Ligand SMILES: O=c1cc[nH]c(=O)[nH]1
C-alpha cells in the first residue's frame with residue numbers, strides 16, 4: 001500500500017523527486033483520474049498540475065550566488081540560475097507539457113521526438129525527431145507524463161545520448177509513474193534525474209499503470 | 225505590386241478570406257519576418273497574430289440565431305455556433321497554433337498529422353496520424369502556418385477525406401501563403417475554406433516563400 | 449432600427465470607430481448579455497471580447513514605416529509603432545480590461561481613477577487616482593466597458609486634461625454604449641477617439657443601457 | 673539571521689505558513705528585488721511568484737475525502753475541496769494578485785477595499801469597498817503583497833469582521849512581511865492564517881521594509 005511504495009523508491013532511488021503531496025495536488029489528481037471528468041475540465045486541471053510540476057523540476061538546475069542592491073539602497077543576496085536549457089517532448093503526450101515550460105520559461109527551445117513500438121515486434125523505434133542544434137551543450141528537460149514500462153523514455157534518453165547530451169544533464173519530468181518504470185530508468189541510466197507527482201501501484205495485464213489515469217494523450221487531446 | 229496579386233487572388237479565389245490588413249497586423253508581421261528578431265519576441269508576436277487569425281477563422285462556421293433575455297428583462301437577438309469541431313495540426317509547424325485554438329475554444333479536440341517528404345523522392349508521405357474517432361462528423365480547422373507549394377496541406381486534405389470528412393467542412397487556417405499554393409489547393413480541393421494573414425509574391429529556388437518568414441517551425445520552436 | 453442607429457452614429461461622429469460586426473462578435477455578445485449566463489462563462493467571454501476590442505483600438509496609435517530584411521535576405525516594408533502609452537482604468541469596471549491590455553502590451557504602465565456620483569445631486573466626483581508621473585506626454589488608453597450618460601468618463605477626461613494630457617491623445621476603449629453617452633462625450637471633447645463594439649437603443653430611468661448588459665462590474669467580479 | 677528570524681516567526685506563530693525557500697523562489701525574489709529590474713521583467717516574475725504563493729495558500733482550505741474510479745475500473749481515494757470562497761483585494765497593490773487567483777479559481781468572486789492612512793495622524797480609514805453580499809458565509813483569500821506596519825490589513829480585517837466574516841475563515845495572502853507587521857496581525861486577530869513568501873529584517877523611518885522591494889504597487893503598475 002501507497003506509503004510503503006514511496007518509502008522504498010524514495011529510499012532505493014536518490015535521484016527521483018516526488019512533489020509534495022499537498023491536499024490540492026491530490027484534489028487535482030482526483031479530478032484527472034476520474035473517468036467521469038469531462039474534457040474541458042481534464043485539460044484545465046492537467047495544465048495546472050503541470051505548471052506546478054515544472055516549477056518543481058526547475059529547481060533541479062545549477063545556480064549562481066547573486067547579490068543585488070534593492071531600492072532601499074541596501075544589499076540583498078540572491079541566486080541567479082544560469083544554465084542553457086531546452087525542453088524535449090516525447091510525441092504525442094509530452095507535448096501537453098510544452099505549454100507550461102513555455103509559460104515559465106519564455107521562448108525556451110523545444111525539441112521533439114516521436115517514438116513508436118512496432119505493431120508486431122513491440123520494439124520502440126525512433127520515428128521522427130527535431131531538436132536544437134547544440135542540445136549536446138544544454139540541460140534537457142525531458143517531458144512525458146507517464147512512465148509505465150519505461151520503454152519509451154529509455155529509447156528517448158538513448159538517442160539524446162547518441163547526440164552527445166550528458167546523462168547527468170537530463171531532467172526527466174513525469175506526472176505519473178509505476179515502480180517498474182522507475183527501476184528500469186535507473187537501471188539503464190542511473191545518472192538522470194526524475195521529478196514526478198505520483199507513483200502508483202503497478203501495471204495492468206495490458207501494461208497500464210494502476211490505479212492510474214488511463215491513456216493520457218488521449219484524454220488530453222480529445223482523441224479517445 | 226502586392227495590391228494586384230491580392231486583387232487577383234481575391235477575384236479568382238472566392239473561398240479565400242484574407243484578413244484585415246491593419247497597421248497592427250503589419251506591425252506584427254514586420255517583427256516576425258525580421259531576421260533580426262529574437263526567439264522570445266518572435267514567439268510572443270506570432271502567438272498574438274495567431275490569436276487574431278483563429279478569431280477570424282472561427283467566423284467561417286455555421287451559426288444558429290438566438291433570442292436571449294437580458295438582465296433588463298428585454299429580449300435580445302443574437303447567434304449561437306452549434307457545430308461540432310476540432311483542430312488538426314500539421315506536425316510540427318501546425319502545432320504552434322494549437323495553443324491559440326485552445327485559448328478561444330476550451331477543450332476542443334486536437335488531431336495531429338505528420339507528413340514528410342521522402343528525402344530522395346521529394347514526395348509527401350503520411351508518417352503519423354492521431355485523430356478524433358468521429359472526425360467524419362466534424363468541422364476541421366486545419367492548421368499550417370505556411371503554404372508554399374501546398375504539398376503538405378494537399379496530402380493532409382487527402383487523408384482527411386479518406387477518413388470521411390466533408391471537403392466543404394475543412395477550414396484551412398494559414399498565416400502566410402504564396403499564390404500558387406492557393407492556386408494548387410483550389411485546383412485540387414475547391415470546396416475548402418482558407419483564411420490567411422498574408423499572401424506573398426513568389427516562391428524561391430529552394431521553394432521558400434518570398435519575401436517570406438523563413439522556416440517557421442524552426443523559428444518558433446528554436447531548432448534554429 | 450439597429451443598422452439605422454449604428455450608421456447614424458458612424459456618419460455623425462467621425463472619431464468613433466465601431467468594431468466589425470462579425471457573427472462571432474455577436475455570439476460573444478449574446479452570451480455576455482444573457483441574464484442566464486453563469487459567472488465563469490461571463491468572464492470567459494468578456495475577456496475573449498476585450499482582447500479583440502483592445503487589438504482594434506491599438507490601431508488608433510501612430511506609426512512609422514519600417515523596412516526590414518527577411519531571413520531570405522530580401523526586404524520587407526512594414527511599419528512600427530513608436531509611442532509612449534499607458535492605460536487608465538476607471539475603477540472598478542475598467543479594471544476588467546487592464547488584463548487584456550497587459551496581455552498584448554507587456555508591462556504597460558497602468559493608472560487608475562475612482563470616481564463617485566455624488567448622493568445629493570449626482571455630480572461625478574473624483575474619489576481617488578494613481579497615474580503615471582509623465583502622463584502629460586503619453587497616449588492614453590482610457591478604459592470603461594460601459595458608457596451610458598458618459599458622466600464618469602467625461603469626468604475622467606476632465607482630470608486627465610487637467611494634468612496636461614492632450615485631448616487628441618485619448619483613446620476611449622469601450623464595449624457597449626448608448627447613443628446619448630456618445631453625443632455628450634463628443635460634444636464636450638470632440639477631439640478624442642472612441643472604439644466600441646456595440647451601440648444600444650436607450651437608457652432607463654435607472655440609467656441602465658437597454659437592452660444592455662446589466663451591471664458590468666458586478667457581473668464580472670461577481671458582486672451581484 | 674534569516675533562519676533565526678524565520679524560525680523564530682515559525683515557532684512563535686503556529687498560524688503562519690512560509691513558502692518552501694527553494695532556490696527557484698529565491699531567484700525570483702532576487703529579480704523582483706533588484707532596483708535595476710525593468711518593468712516588464714518585474715511583472716513577469718512577480719506574477720510567476722504570486723501564482724506559486726496562491727497554490728500554497730489554497731491548501732489552507734478545508735477538504736473532504738473522495739473516491740472515484742479510474743478509466744481502468746479501479747477506485748482511487750482523493751480529497752475534494754468544497755467551500756464557498758472569494759478573494760478580497762486591498763487596492764491597489766493587492767489587485768496585482770487577483771489575476772493569479774483568477775487563473776486557478778475560474779470566475780472566483782472578487783471583492784475590493786481601498787484604505788487610506790490619514791495624513792495628519794496615521795489611522796487608515798476605509799475609502800471604498802465593494803464585496804460579495806454572500807460574504808459572511810465564505811472563506812476569504814485576503815490579498816496584499818507587502819505587510820509592513822500591518823495597519824492596512826488589520827483595517828481590512830476589521831471591516832470583514834464587521835461584515836460577519838468568521839475570523840478563522842480568513843486566509844491572508846502575502847509576499848513580504850516584516851516581523852513587526854506579523855506580530856500586530858496575530859496580537860489583533862490570532863485565529864487567522866497567514867501565508868507569506870518572505871520575512872525581512874526591519875521596517876524603516878518612512879515605513880519601508882528592508883532590504884525589501886520598495887513600493888510594490890507602483891513598481892508593478894508602473895506609476896513610480
Ligand atoms: O497507464 C498508462 C500507461 C501508458 N500510457 C498511458 O497513457 N497510460
Ligand SMILES: O=c1cc[nH]c(=O)[nH]1
Pocket residue numbers: 317370372431432433436437438439440441
Ligand atoms: O517558406 C517556407 C516554406 C516551408 N516552411 C516554412 O516554414 N517556410
Ligand SMILES: O=c1cc[nH]c(=O)[nH]1
Pocket residue numbers: 541594595596655656657660661662663664665
Ligand atoms: O447599463 C449600464 C450603464 C452603466 N454602467 C453599467 O454597468 N451598466
Ligand SMILES: O=c1cc[nH]c(=O)[nH]1
Pocket residue numbers: 818819820879880881882884885886887888889
Ligand atoms: O516596503 C514596502 C512597504 C509597504 N509597501 C510597499 O509597497 N513596500
